[PDB]
Amino acid sequence: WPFGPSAVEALIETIDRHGRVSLNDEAKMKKVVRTWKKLIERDDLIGEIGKHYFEAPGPLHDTYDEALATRLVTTYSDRGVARAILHTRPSDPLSKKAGQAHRLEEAVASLWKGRGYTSDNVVSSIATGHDVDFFAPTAFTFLVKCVESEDDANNAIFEYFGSNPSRYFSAVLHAMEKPDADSRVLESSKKWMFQCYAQKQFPTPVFERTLAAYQYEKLSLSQIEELVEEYSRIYS
């Protein structure tokens, strides 16, 4: 504390030093020989140093994140933790807190995947009660960490919406109106729905009829016409 290190502590500080200044072949070859000599010269080092790295392999390790998530999910429910993840996400990209937050949310995503959750379980956990909230950046980001892509995220929202293109579009647009919207990602979700219909080869007239038939606040006559026009001009 104010005093000398144990043999174990001292050797650990050496190995760390060597791994932090990183570097250089000729230096490596000599330093590793020296370290080896120290490890073998007595019989009470290998076990303890091994255990030390086992419990903490390096400065980027996240060894116990799953246990933490298990504790938290168990204590505060899937909905509790979804809410906390969505709400405490720092808005500042340079936030000192973003790392911690990414660890927590990534730990929850992994835990859920490993328990066998579906896309639907994830969206359901995220659900606030307002469709538009799915496309809010803080929510959409988490969702993407859970289902691994924008394609799967959009698709999961669509399916959670009973696969209703009108509900989906309404949500995307309303979202676009929102104050901190990420218009590029929203543009991408919109494009995604259109592309779903194109891929399945819908004629524009059938697209229009589909939008109408599926009628959560609905789409305006002008909205339906605008969507149909886009479909017609862009996605054949």
Q: Please report, for the chain, the start and end positions of each structural domain, with discontinuous segments joined by +.
A: 1-59, 60-236
* Identity of residue 160: Y
Are the C-beta atoms of 153 and 196 separated by less than 8 Å? no
Nearest of 158, 182, 159, 179 to residue 170 by alpha carbon: 158
Q: How far apart are CA 210 and CA 50, in angstroms?
A: 64
Nearest of 197, 221, 222, 215 to residue 207 by alpha carbon: 197
CATH for the 1-59 domain, from 3.40.50.620, 1.20.5.2710, 3.40.50.300, 3.40.50.2300 = 1.20.5.2710
SS3 content of the chain, % helix, strand, coil (to 5): 70, 0, 30
Resolution in A: 2.3
Query: By CB neighbour count within 10 A (0-12 exposed, 13-18 middle, 19+ buried), where does 110 fall?
Result: middle
Q: How far apart are CA 158 and CA 17, in angstroms?
A: 52
Residue 43: phi and psi, rounded to 5, are -110, 10
Q: How far apart are CA 13 and CA 53, in angstroms?
A: 12
Q: How far apart are CA 152 and CA 119, in angstroms?
A: 8
Are the C-beta atoms of 65 and 24 separated by less than 8 Å? no
Q: How far apart are CA 189 and CA 218, in angstroms?
A: 18
Q: How far apart are CA 150 and CA 140, in angstroms?
A: 9
- Mapped onto helix, strand or coil, the DSSP state of residue 179 is coil
Task: List Cβ neighbours of 194 (8 Å cut-off, separation of 6 or more).
Answer: 227, 230, 231, 234, 235
Are the C-beta atoms of 29 and 5 separated by less than 8 Å? no
- Mapped onto helix, strand or coil, the DSSP state of residue 1 is coil
* Identity of residue 191: K
Pair of tokens at residue 102: 């990414």
Query: By CB neighbour count within 10 A (0-12 exposed, 13-18 middle, 19+ buried), where does 204 fall?
Result: middle
Pair of tokens at residue 71: 């504790």
Pair of tokens at residue 171: 């949500």
Nearest of 140, 124, 146, 132 to residue 179 by alpha carbon: 132
